[PDB]
């Protein structure tokens with residue numbers, strides 16, 4: 001488990017509230033405000049989930065071996081409804097629970113490059129107290145191609161070798177604005193931003 | 198990587214045809230012929246997929262901690278069509294890919310006879326049928342129902358603490374459904390005919 005995490009005392013899960021003025025808080029706030037300057041952050045919590053971390057780090061090591069000298073990991077945003085937050089915190093991102101996206105590049109979990117995309121009410125639905133929720137997520141994007149609405153897994157790199165797959169898909173390979181992942185433990189929810197208008 | 202695997206010359210995936218009449222082949226043949234003795238076995242292959250095995254062993258250690266006991270694993274059967282065999286060998290079982298009466302997961306049978314039905318182990322253009330022997334993390338289980346995307350909670354007072362799998366019948370189970378990647382490791386592939 002990462003050495004800067006708070007001691008959990010044999011606990012496998014906890015949320016840690018970050019302090020404004022710490023570099024850890026301030027970098028997430030800057031990443032968010034770059035495209036969401038009109039919203040205000042209530043708090044940022046570090047997600048310490050031992051089991052999700054273990055499974056994710058195993059998948060990362062495998063993709064680092066398979067792809068050899070690629071930047072396989074991106075830090076991306078995911079807006080969700082309050083009713084989903086307890087499940088994501090404990091179990092991560094389940095494609096079986098994902099909605100149809102307004103522009104579908106496949107049936108998977110969607111992650112945004114820009115916080116502004118995730119900040120739409122359609123993804124970060126305001127709760128009964130006007131709080132919006134967005135995860136900051138380590139995503140194994142690996143080698144990616146433009147997706148298509150029919151995909152249930154990423155497409156093959158070569159049609160004559162149907163099982164050798166891209167790691168993820170995007171809307172545009174030249175200027176990616178979203179990524180779609182189709183497998184469990186390909187994304188680690190690292191921070192939860194609670195924010196308001 | 199388990200003792201009974203044979204050397205892979207620094208590769209991460211291999212299918213190894215078992216030798217008839219040796220202990221390993223005999224163990225797997227007997228599990229199948231318990232209910233499928235009228236079939237003809239052409240071959241049994243051991244699936245050596247390092248990455249699937251790693252991801253499965255991690256989930257096993259996690260389930261052994263969560264459940265506070267070490268009896269979470271069952272050996273079950275899965276019939277599939279010939280065109281799905283390369284995908285399962287390389288990537289394992291994928292719920293996103295027949296009836297799903299007990300939930301939208303991957304189905305495993307207690308009896309080879311159930312998986313030997315032509316609707317599951319679809320005969321290819323040469324009459325050959327395919328069935329996996331699968332290590333499955335069934336863990337603590339409950340009765341499934343149509344439309345589940347995950348197992349139910351163990352107590353709806355804590356809705357995120359889930360059963361590990363569902364079944365048709367808790368007292369005398371004949372099939373199990375799992376809803377997560379890397380809860381099932383395909384260990385052997387049986388090629389057989391009617």
Ligand SMILES: O=C1N=NC(=O)c2cc(OCC3CCC3)ccc21
Pocket residue numbers: 274275276277295296297298299304305306311312313317318372
């Ligand atoms: O071996 C199988 N391979 N693929 C399946 O979809 C499958 C499904 C299965 O029960 C599905 C429903 C009938 C009552 C529940 C049993 C076995 C298999």
